[PDB]
Amino acid sequence: SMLTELIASNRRSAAIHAFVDTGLSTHFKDGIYVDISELSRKSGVNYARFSRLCDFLVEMGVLVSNDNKFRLSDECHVFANPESFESFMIKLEICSHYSNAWLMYGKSLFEDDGKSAFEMAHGRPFFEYLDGNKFLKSNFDALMTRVSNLIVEKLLGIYDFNQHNRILDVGGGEGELLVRISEKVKGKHYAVLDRYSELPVSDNIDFINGNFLNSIPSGYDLYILKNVLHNWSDSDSILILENFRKAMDKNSSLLLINMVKEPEFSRSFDILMDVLFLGKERSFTEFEYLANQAGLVVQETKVIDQSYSPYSFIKLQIK
Amino acid sequence: SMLTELIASNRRSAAIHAFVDTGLSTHFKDGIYVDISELSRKSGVNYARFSRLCDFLVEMGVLVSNDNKFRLSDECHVFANPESFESFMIKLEICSHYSNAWLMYGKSLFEDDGKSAFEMAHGRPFFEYLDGNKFLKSNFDALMTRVSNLIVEKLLGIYDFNQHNRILDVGGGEGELLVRISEKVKGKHYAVLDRYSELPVSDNIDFINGNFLNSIPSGYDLYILKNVLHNWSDSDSILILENFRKAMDKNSSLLLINMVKEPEFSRSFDILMDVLFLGKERSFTEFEYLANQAGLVVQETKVIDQSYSPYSFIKLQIK
Numbered sequence: 001s002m003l004t005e006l007i008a009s010n011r012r013s014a015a016i017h018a019f020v021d022t023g024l025s026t027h028f029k030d031g032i033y034v035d036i037s038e039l040s041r042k043s044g045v046n047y048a049r050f051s052r053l054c055d056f057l058v059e060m061g062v063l064v065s066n067d068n069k070f071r072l073s074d075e076c077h078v079f080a081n082p083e084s085f086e087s088f089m090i091k092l093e094i095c096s097h098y099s100n101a102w103l104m105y106g107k108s109l110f111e112d113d114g115k116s117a118f119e120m121a122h123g124r125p126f127f128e129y130l131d132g133n134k135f136l137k138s139n140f141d142a143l144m145t146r147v148s149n150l151i152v153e154k155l156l157g158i159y160d161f162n163q164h165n166r167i168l169d170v171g172g173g174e175g176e177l178l179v180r181i182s183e184k185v186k187g188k189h190y191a192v193l194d195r196y197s198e199l200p201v202s203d204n205i206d207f208i209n210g211n212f213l214n215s216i217p218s219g220y221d222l223y224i225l226k227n228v229l230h231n232w233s234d235s236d237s238i239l240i241l242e243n244f245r246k247a248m249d250k251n252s253s254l255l256l257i258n259m260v261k262e263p264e265f266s267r268s269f270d271i272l273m274d275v276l277f278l279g280k281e282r283s284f285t286e287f288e289y290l291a292n293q294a295g296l297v298v299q300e301t302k303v304i305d306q307s308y309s310p311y312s313f314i315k316l317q318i319k
Numbered sequence: 320s321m322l323t324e325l326i327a328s329n330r331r332s333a334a335i336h337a338f339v340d341t342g343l344s345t346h347f348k349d350g351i352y353v354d355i356s357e358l359s360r361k362s363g364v365n366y367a368r369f370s371r372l373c374d375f376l377v378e379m380g381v382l383v384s385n386d387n388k389f390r391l392s393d394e395c396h397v398f399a400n401p402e403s404f405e406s407f408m409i410k411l412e413i414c415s416h417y418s419n420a421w422l423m424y425g426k427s428l429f430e431d432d433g434k435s436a437f438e439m440a441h442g443r444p445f446f447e448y449l450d451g452n453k454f455l456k457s458n459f460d461a462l463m464t465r466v467s468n469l470i471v472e473k474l475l476g477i478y479d480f481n482q483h484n485r486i487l488d489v490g491g492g493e494g495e496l497l498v499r500i501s502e503k504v505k506g507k508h509y510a511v512l513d514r515y516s517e518l519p520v521s522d523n524i525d526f527i528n529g530n531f532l533n534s535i536p537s538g539y540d541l542y543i544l545k546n547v548l549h550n551w552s553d554s555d556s557i558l559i560l561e562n563f564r565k566a567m568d569k570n571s572s573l574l575l576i577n578m579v580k581e582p583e584f585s586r587s588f589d590i591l592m593d594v595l596f597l598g599k600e601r602s603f604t605e606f607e608y609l610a611n612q613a614g615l616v617v618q619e620t621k622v623i624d625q626s627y628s629p630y631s632f633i634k635l636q637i638k
């Protein structure tokens with residue numbers, strides 16, 4: 001039926017996970033037609049049982065079958081690259097911690113504690129738990145690093161970063177964004193403010209420990225806040241934007257870069273933000289409301305098309 | 320993208336689970352258009368957060384939207400029924416024990432200990448572990464009971480059970496098949512064999528604790544083995560069928576009734592059977608070979624269509 005396969009949608013994610021997490025997918029580099037017989041002998045994977053996974057991978061459209069051999073689809077070439085964002089997305093998606101956070105989702109709806117399905121399963125909010133666990137922090141920050149790398153060229157194209165002097169990336173993580181931005185735009189003061197248990201060091205970047213719930217450090221004519229607000233409630237979102245409005249002056253500008261809600265694209269991400277953070281995806285009009293509540297006004301708006309999600313580029317200044 | 324949503328296929332199964340396991344789906348009985356505001360009052364659930372879950376279920380085609388209200392789709396009416404086979408499938412599908420068995424599937428492909436991905440995760444093979452877990456055994460035995468109920472009328476329609484005197488259902492579970500057959504076909508001796516601690520009780524049925532790997536008891540002219548062989552290797556399947564051959568005389572018959580591999584339908588179940596049992600889904604020809612090696616021959620063959628899978632009906636007799 002169409003129902004039983006929709007109920008069994010987990011199997012798709014899990015079949016891809018086995019393929020990419022083991023590193024079997026890395027043997028399919030450069031759209032090569034792999035002999036599963038050869039791969040079995042070399043890699044030590046069972047021939048019969050992996051042939052059968054490959055059959056299910058063709059059905060999903062991850063593999064293509066020609067002359068009793070398999071290649072990655074033109075679209076699924078990224079599964080050959082361990083450093084691809086898709087590969088890091090798979091690692092987290094159906095990991096033990098995410099699985100148990102989803103099992104509490106149903107329960108999370110009934111209660112009004114402000115506790116995420118993740119917190120109900122593990123005992124601390126996502127980022128407070130990523131302090132303790134190295135597997136989740138190293139893979140999450142890697143994902144945010146890879147998706148940051150793909151939007152660098154799109155951001156530099158639509159905005160002139162060469163007009164600004166001091167740039168602060170609020171919640172940058174590894175700081176990949178300003179690292180890659182500094183390689184095109186030189187002779188600027190670069191700073192990445194995050195929750196740091198250990199300090200990373202980048203020649204051009206000035207890594208600071210902070211908390212944008214508490215205070216944004218003033219003395220910056222450009223502020224960057226990319227993919228943060230979707231990890232927070234409307235109240236917590238306004239609080240962050242008000243900390244900017246207190247830190248900023250009239251000459252200062254805030255770039256609000258975030259995955260935007262559109263009816264065309266899937267809602268699945270909106271749910272995952274609920275599960276992990278009690279967050280949500282928002283439209284431009286919804287982001288503008290939270291900005292007009294915090295005492296900021298939209299100077300400029302631009303749409304960015306990433307493969308995975310459309311983004312909203314909003315330039316915010318104080319009233 | 321098409322790729323990121325294929326990677327996030329688990330989110331589909333997770334959203335349905337939170338709807339059906341919470342019993343919120345049971346408020347959508349008889350294709351009624353539910354008011355999410357009304358339900359929020361009645362149930363005590365979060366409106367805004369559940370409104371979003373319902374938006375994602377519409378996208379999947381589980382709910383349908385009219386006048387800002389939600390009904391279950393024509394094919395998703397079964398979610399309102401907590402006795403439906405789909406409602407049991409959902410709960411087992413992404414439960415703790417299955418999830419962790421999928422995380423070991425990757426590893427399981429390289430090793431050859433005769434250990435399943437479930438045995439690697441939990442420390443025992445599927446059915447032996449169910450002896451120790453009431454949540455898994457009850458939900459599993461319930462699922463098997465609901466799918467066995469659905470096939471009863473088709474099996475009676477194609478085969479004459481009136482010609483037989485003594486009938487044994489091997490691996491019959493709760494025994495739903497012979498329970499529903501004994502109500503239509505009276506005056507027979509009905510026996511059900513399975514791995515029992517506490518024996519089931521039905522007035523018409525003699526429930527026998529046993530192990531089909533060790534021995535099948537003789538003295539029955541009809542044997543039935545439904546949805547068993549797909550949980551076992553070629554060798555274990557041959558062993559099982561050999562025990563039938565030893566147990567049967569010339570006038571004795573065996574009904575091998577099992578879901579069959581047809582290219583049109585998904586392979587996702589073939590992977591699950593590998594994860595849980597090192598089992599597989601087989602074509603008619605493959606079933607005929609294993610039987611032929613056991614020393615049995617095909618007498619009659621018939622196709623049965625169920626919504627979730629096609630079935631092979633193979634009447635088997637000793638050479």
Ligand SMILES: Nc1ncnc2c1ncn2[C@@H]1O[C@H](CSCC[C@H](N)C(=O)O)[C@@H](O)[C@H]1O
Binds near residue numbers: 148212227
């Ligand atoms: N109070 C806080 N102060 C600083 N950083 C925080 C924070 N709460 C969360 N963060 C960090 O903010 C990041 C959100 S994910 C976004 C990362 C990056 N801006 C990108 O777009 O790719 C995480 O790295 C998280 O650790």
Ligand SMILES: Nc1ncnc2c1ncn2[C@@H]1O[C@H](CSCC[C@H](N)C(=O)O)[C@@H](O)[C@H]1O
Binds near residue numbers: 446492512530547
């Ligand atoms: N060694 C063994 N001997 C007997 N029954 C066994 C067994 N190993 C597993 N089983 C049983 O085999 C069944 C497989 S599920 C199929 C159940 C039933 N025939 C139906 O079609 O609905 C389970 O009920 C399990 O308890």
Ligand SMILES: COc1cc(O)c2c(c1)C(=O)c1cccc(OC)c1C2=O
Binds near residue numbers: 409412
């Ligand atoms: C939760 O994961 C599952 C484990 C299972 O063992 C099964 C199923 C799901 C089924 O959906 C299923 C459907 C119809 C007939 C079935 O019996 C062969 C099954 C079955 O066995």
Ligand SMILES: [Cl-]
Binds near residue numbers: 614615
């Ligand atoms: Cl033989």
